Design a binder for this molecule. Structure first.
Ligand SMILES: O=C(O)C1=C(C(=O)Nc2sccc2-c2ccccc2)CCC1
Length: 133
């Protein structure tokens, strides 16, 4: 029910410090240049307790389906094989990805008409702002 604010089709409108975030998660030069150009969408839907987040882009297409609190395997757009757990902290979706003893945290929040994504690994923070399609 809290997930209702997130449901719909969203398209990337702005990006801050994303190159350095990609560097921190381990993305190489060529891939960062090509991925950096992409304008992914974010299609969020719900069926019972299952949340599905799909992203399509010229870089890579991804899809995850999950239940809140329940760890799952995810393959990220940059091909990390991660263990992911997504929880609701108030009305913020908090997504932790763990692999190879590392961790990154992705928060999705509604702010005005936007869906703001903050991505954090180590000292490095990037913001990806989406708006409704
Ligand atoms: O690309 C993003 O805006 C978001 C996430 C992400 O980890 N993206 C990531 S992580 C490393 C690369 C990408 C990427 C780059 C271009 C297109 C699609 C994906 C997590 C949620 C929002």
């Amino acid at each position: 029910h809290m997930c209702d604010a997130f449901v719909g089709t969203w398209k990337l409108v702005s990006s801050e410090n994303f190159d350095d975030y990609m560097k921190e998660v381990g993305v190489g030069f060529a891939t960062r240049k090509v991925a950096g150009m992409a304008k992914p969408n974010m299609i969020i839907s719900v069926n019972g307790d299952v949340i599905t987040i799909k992203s399509e882009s010229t870089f890579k297409n991804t899809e995850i389906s999950f239940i809140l609190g329940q760890e799952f395997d995810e393959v990220t757009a940059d091909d990390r094989k991660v263990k992911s757990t997504i929880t609701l902290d108030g009305g913020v979706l908090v997504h932790v990805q763990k692999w190879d003893g590392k961790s990154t945290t992705i928060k999705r929040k509604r702010e005005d008409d936007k869906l703001v994504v903050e991505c954090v690994m180590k000292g490095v923070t990037s913001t990806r702002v989406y708006e409704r399609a």
